[PDB]
Design a protein around this ligand. Structure first.
Ligand SMILES: NCCc1c[nH]cn1
Length: 167
């Protein structure tokens, strides 16, 4: 049993809810929250900008030190950093950004990072400002992640479309 409430069950391991991931993280304090990161961990907008704002910029300060030491992530890659006030840990995962021309096949590689964690609160990778089809992102998630993932979808209209169209 876990603390997540109000989710619709899509599969054995994937759950979904219309929720603001920031507000959900603050309520649940999950072991892992996933950030929709870019390779520079520049948390300007979308999910990343919202998570970072909720940490009062402490996520960005920590991320800048990570990049100064390690250099940029790979598209499809990830790193584990602090969850600050939102979670124990933040898994920063880089899905491909269609608005930069990145290979959508890298979305499966991105989701494979989730398998290193038994339970996660996450957004749909490569959705929102990264420009990919969220229906596709949900299908890749279900067909890739084997650990227990609780997906937060900010937009109610999109949530209802994801559920209604789910095979
Ligand atoms: N408060 C809205 C956070 C968010 C979710 N998705 C994109 N941004």
């Amino acid at each position: 049993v876990n603390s997540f409430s109000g989710y619709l069950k899509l599969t054995d391991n994937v759950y979904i809810k219309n929720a603001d991931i920031v507000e959900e993280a603050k309520k649940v304090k999950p072991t892992v929250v996933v950030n929709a990161a870019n390779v520079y961990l520049k948390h300007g907008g979308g999910v990343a900008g919202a998570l970072n704002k909720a940490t009062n910029n402490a996520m960005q300060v920590e991320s800048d030190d990570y990049i100064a030491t390690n250099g940029p992530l790979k598209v499809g890659g990830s790193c584990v950093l602090s969850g600050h006030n939102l979670a124990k840990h933040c898994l920063h995962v880089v899905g491909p950004n269609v608005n930069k021309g990145e290979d959508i096949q890298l979305l499966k590689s991105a989701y494979e990072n989730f398998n290193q964690h038994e339970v996660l609160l996450a957004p749909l990778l490569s959705a929102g400002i990264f420009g990919a089809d969220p229906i596709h992102s949900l299908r890749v998630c279900v067909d890739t992640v084997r650990t227990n993932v609780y997906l937060a979808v900010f937009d109610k209209n999109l949530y209802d479309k994801l559920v209604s169209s789910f095979l």
